[PDB]
C-alpha cells in the first residue's frame, strides 16, 4: 500500500569503512537506493501528503475533443446534409500525447456531442446520430433506407436541448487497445502497396459515426458537431517514452525530417546559467 | 407526481464531472482480460526511474544533436576549476525538460519531495580523479569559487571501480508545496543551483586518452508527490493533422 | 422514469441559498493546516475589546485630525460646570462611529445588550479632582445643570493611583431588541445621553501643568447580541479601482 508519501527518520553522522551508500554502479540498470537519511543529517518529518490524484482514473477521467463534423449549406465537403466519420482518437494532439504514453489500454467511454451553428448561435433543428458497426450498411444520402436504425443504436436530439451523451463499453476482439502495431495485417508479400497498411491494426477499427438532419428537403442552417470523449475504468500496460516532435498524419509516427528540434530549451555556455 | 425544484446549475456540460449515462448496448459482455506483464497502477510508480539529463544543452544543429547527453572532463592546472552549473527546478524549462520526470511534472501544478541526480564516469580504466558536487539552497547566488561553494551541502566523488555516485537534493523549503518556477515573480519557488568542481585533477598515464565524458541520470525519491492536474504548456501540432 | 412536478421556484439564483454543486477537481487534497495563533470563532469574541472613542469630534482639518481622540480638562470656578455630552447610540452616526463595535454593528440591523465606557486620566501625578458621569434614560432631555443630571444612574470618579473608571450603561428598554436609531421616526430607539460634570475642581500645585486630557474607551458586555445581517451604509470606492 501507498496512501501517503514516506516519512523521514532521524539520522546522525557516520564514520565507518566498508559500507558505502553513496557509491553506485548504474551500469547494472537499476535505480538508486540511497535515501536522504543516509547521506546528510536529517530530522523526523511526518508526511501526510495524499497520492490519490496521480492514479490512472484520476489522470484520464477528463473530457477532451476528438472529433469535428461540418454540415455546410454551400461548399464541397458535405453539401447533402449527411456525414460519415470513422471513429479515431489520433486526430488531435492534446489527447493523443496523453494516451500514447502507454502501449495497451482497456477502458470504457462517455461521449458527449455539442452542436451549434458556425457563428455559435443556437437554432431549432433536429438531427440523428447513428452508430454503424463494421460490416453494417453505411448511409449514402439524407433519405437513405439504412436510416431506419432497426438494429443499430441511434439518438434523436435537438439543438436547443442540452448536449446528448451516452456510455460506451469495451468492444475490442483483443484483450486491450494498442496504439502501436509493429507489423502488417495480411499474409501478403508486402511489395510496396502493403506498406500503406504498415501498423494498420484491425483491432482498433471500431466502426463509423453517422449524422444527418431529419427531413426530406435541405435544411436552413449550417451546423457543426463537436465530439468529446472521457475515459473511465482505465488500465494501462508497458509505458514508453513520450512524444518529442510535431505530428503529421493520423495513426502514423511520421515526423518532419528536415526540421528536427531539441526536446527543451538551449543556452549559450555550460558554465553559465 | 413528486414536486421538485431546479437549482441554478442545470444544463451545463462540465468536463471533469463524474456522472451516470444511458448505455447503448444492452446485455454486452467484453472480451476476457488475459495477464499482460508490466501493469502501471499509479503515475508515481514510473516517476522514480532514472533518465538521462541534458546538462550540456549548448548545441542546436541537426548533426550534433546527440552531443547534448554528456559533458567533457580533462586535465587542468589544479586550481579548482569549474565544470558545469544548472538550476535544480524540475518544472522550469531547461536541462530537466529532457527527463520523464520533467515531462510528467508539466501536467501537475504543484510538487513536493526530494530529487536525486546520479553521475556516471565513462573514461579509461587508468584515469583517476576526484570531483566536488555542491547544491546551493535558495538565496545564495552562483558560487564564484570552490571555497564559496563548499559551504552548502555537498558530496565528494572518487573515481574507481564503482563508477557512479548519487547526489541527493533534500527537500528544503519554506512552504509545504512549490509551484512551477519561472522568470519574474514566480522565482519565489526557485529550488537552488548545482555546481561541479575539480577537486585534485584528472590524472592519466602515457598511452591513454586525455578527454572523458560524464553521463547524468535524474529521478525522484520515495516521498515525491504532485497535485492539481492541468494541461501541458506545449502543443505538438501546427494545424490540421 | 419517475414522474415528478416542478414547483414555482425553479431557475432562480438566490444569493443566500445553501446548495450543493459539482466539484471541478476530482480527488483533490488540500495542504495541511498548521497551528496559527489567534483564531476567531465568532464575531462576538472581538466585540468586547475596548477601542478609543471620539467624543471630541469637533476638528476637521488635515493637520489636527489627531486631536479628536481626547478632550481637555482644567481648573474652573467650582460651580459644577459641564465638560462634554454625547448620545449613547452605537449604530447611529456620531462619536461611536470610530470604534470596532460601531463599525461591526453597521452590518447588523438589531442589537441588544449592555455597553461599557472607560475613562482614563493622563495628567500629572500631583493633580487631583473628582468628576460625575451621568446617563439619562430615554424621555429626559439634555440636563441643564448638575442637580438635574444626578437623578439618573451615575458614578463618581476619583483621581488617584487607579487612573481608570468604567461607567456601565445598563440595558434599559421597552422592547427586546432595538433597531438602529436615526433622525425622524426612528428616534423611537434612542438609548439616551451621557454627560460629564465637574464635582469639586481640578486642583494643581505650583510648577505643574494646568491642562490635562482624558481618553475614553468603549466596548460591550457579555450579553451583547446582534442579528439580521445586512450590508453597510458606506461604500469605499468612487468608481473603478
Amino acid at each position: 500500500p501507498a496512501p501517503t508519501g514516506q516519512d523521514t527518520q532521524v539520522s546522525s553522522h557516520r564514520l565507518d569503512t566498508g559500507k558505502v551508500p553513496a557509491l553506485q554502479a548504474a551500469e547494472i540498470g537499476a535505480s538508486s537506493n540511497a535515501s536522504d537519511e543516509s547521506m546528510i543529517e536529517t530530522r523526523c518529518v511526518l508526511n501526510s501528503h495524499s497520492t490519490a490524484e496521480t492514479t490512472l482514473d484520476s489522470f484520464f477521467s477528463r473530457a477532451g475533443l476528438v472529433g469535428e463534423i461540418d454540415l455546410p449549406l454551400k461548399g464541397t465537403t458535405n453539401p447533402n446534409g449527411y456525414a460519415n466519420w470513422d471513429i479515431d482518437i489520433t486526430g488531435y494532439a492534446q489527447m493523443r500525447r496523453k494516451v500514447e504514453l502507454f502501449t495497451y489500454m482497456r477502458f470504457d467511454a462517455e461521449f458527449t456531442f455539442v452542436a451549434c451553428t458556425p457563428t455559435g448561435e443556437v437554432v431549432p433543428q433536429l438531427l440523428q446520430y447513428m452508430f454503424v458497426p463494421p460490416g453494417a450498411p453505411k448511409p449514402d444520402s439524407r433519405e437513405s433506407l439504412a436510416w431506419q436504425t432497426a438494429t443499430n443504436p441511434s439518438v434523436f436530439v435537438k439543438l436547443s436541448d442540452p448536449p446528448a451523451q451516452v456510455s460506451v463499453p469495451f468492444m475490442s476482439p483483443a484483450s486491450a487497445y494498442q496504439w502501436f502495431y509493429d507489423g502488417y495485417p495480411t499474409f501478403g508479400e508486402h511489395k510496396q502497396e502493403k506498406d500503406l497498411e504498415y501498423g494498420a491494426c484491425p483491432n482498433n477499427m471500431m466502426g463509423t459515426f453517422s449524422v444527418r438532419t431529419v427531413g426530406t428537403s435541405k435544411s436552413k442552417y449550417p451546423l457543426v458537431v463537436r465530439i468529446y470523449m472521457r475515459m473511465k475504468h482505465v488500465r494501462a500496460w508497458i509505458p514508453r517514452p513520450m512524444r518529442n516532435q510535431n505530428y503529421l498524419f493520423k495513426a502514423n509516427p511520421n515526423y518532419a525530417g528536415n526540421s528536427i528540434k531539441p526536446t527543451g530549451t538551449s543556452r549559450t555556455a555550460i558554465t553559465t546559467l | 407526481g413528486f414536486p421538485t425544484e431546479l437549482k441554478p446549475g442545470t444544463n451545463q456540460f462540465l468536463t471533469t464531472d463524474d456522472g451516470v449515462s444511458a448505455p447503448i448496448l444492452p446485455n454486452f459482455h467484453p472480451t476476457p482480460c488475459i495477464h499482460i506483464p508490466g501493469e502501471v497502477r499509479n503515475l508515481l510508480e514510473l516517476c522514480q526511474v532514472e533518465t538521462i539529463l541534458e546538462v550540456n544543452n549548448v548545441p542546436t544543429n541537426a548533426t550534433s544533436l546527440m552531443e547534448r547527453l554528456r559533458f567533457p572532463v580533462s586535465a587542468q592546472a589544479g586550481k579548482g576549476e569549474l565544470c558545469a552549473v544548472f538550476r535544480a527546478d524540475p518544472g522550469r524549462n531547461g536541462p530537466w525538460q529532457s527527463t520523464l520526470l520533467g515531462q510528467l511534472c508539466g501536467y501537475y501544478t504543484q510538487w513536493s519531495g526530494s530529487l536525486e541526480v546520479t553521475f556516471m564516469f565513462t573514461g579509461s580504466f587508468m584515469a583517476t580523479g576526484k570531483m566536488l558536487i555542491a547544491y546551493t539552497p535558495p538565496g545564495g547566488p552562483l558560487p564564484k569559487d570552490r571555497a564559496t561553494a563548499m559551504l552548502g551541502t555537498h558530496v565528494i566523488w572518487d573515481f574507481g571501480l564503482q563508477s557512479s555516485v548519487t547526489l541527493v537534493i533534500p527537500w528544503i523549503s519554506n512552504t509545504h508545496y512549490r509551484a512551477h518556477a519561472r522568470d519574474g515573480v514566480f522565482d519565489y519557488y526557485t529550488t537552488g543551483l548545482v555546481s561541479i568542481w575539480y577537486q585534485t585533477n584528472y590524472v592519466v598515464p602515457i598511452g591513454a586518452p586525455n578527454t572523458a565524458y560524464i553521463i547524468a541520470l535524474a529521478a525522484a525519491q520515495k516521498n515525491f508527490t504532485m497535485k492539481l492536474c492541468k494541461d501541458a504548456s506545449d502543443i505538438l501540432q501546427t494545424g490540421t493533422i | 422514469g419517475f414522474p415528478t412536478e416542478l414547483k414555482p421556484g425553479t431557475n432562480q439564483f438566490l444569493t443566500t441559498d445553501d446548495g450543493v454543486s459539482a466539484p471541478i477537481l476530482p480527488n483533490f487534497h488540500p495542504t495541511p493546516c498548521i497551528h496559527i495563533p489567534g483564531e476567531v470563532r465568532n464575531l462576538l469574541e472581538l466585540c468586547q475589546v475596548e477601542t478609543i472613542l471620539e467624543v471630541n469630534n469637533v476638528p476637521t482639518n488635515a493637520t489636527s485630525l489627531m486631536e479628536r481622540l481626547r478632550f481637555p480638562v482644567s481648573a474652573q470656578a467650582g460651580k459644577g460646570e459641564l465638560c462634554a455630552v454625547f448620545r449613547a447610540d452605537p449604530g447611529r452616526n456620531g462619536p461611536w462611529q470610530s470604534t470596532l463595535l460601531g463599525q461591526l454593528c453597521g452590518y447588523y440591523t438589531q442589537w441588544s445588550g449592555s455597553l461599557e465606557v472607560t475613562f482614563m486620566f493622563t495628567g500629572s501625578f500631583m493633580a487631583t479632582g473628582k468628576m460625575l458621569i451621568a446617563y439619562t434614560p430615554p424621555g429626559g432631555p439634555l440636563p441643564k445643570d448638575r442637580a438635574t443630571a444626578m437623578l439618573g444612574t451615575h458614578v463618581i470618579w476619583d483621581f488617584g493611583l487607579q487612573s481608570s473608571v468604567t461607567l456601565v450603561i445598563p440595558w434599559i428598554s421597552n422592547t427586546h431588541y432595538r433597531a438602529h436609531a436615526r433622525d425622524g421616526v426612528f428616534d423611537y430607539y434612542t438609548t439616551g445621553l451621557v454627560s460629564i460634570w465637574y464635582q469639586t475642581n481640578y486642583v494643581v500645585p505650583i510648577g505643574a501643568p494646568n491642562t490635562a486630557y482624558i481618553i475614553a474607551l468603549a466596548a460591550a458586555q457579555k450579553n451583547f447580541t446582534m442579528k439580521l445581517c445586512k450590508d453597510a451604509s458606506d461604500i469605499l470606492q468612487t468608481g473603478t479601482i
Partner: peptide, 30 residues
C-alpha cells in the same frame, strides 16, 4: 460507484485502491 441501469459499464468512475509497485520498473534486478 453509483449506478441506475442494468449494465455495470454505465456507472461512475468511483474511487480506486491506492497501491504501488515501484520495484517493477526501477529495480528489476534478479
Amino acid at each position: 460507484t453509483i449506478n441506475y441501469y442494468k449494465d455495470s459499464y454505465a456507472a461512475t468512475a468511483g474511487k480506486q485502491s491506492l497501491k504501488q509497485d515501484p520495484d517493477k520498473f526501477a529495480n528489476p534486478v534478479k
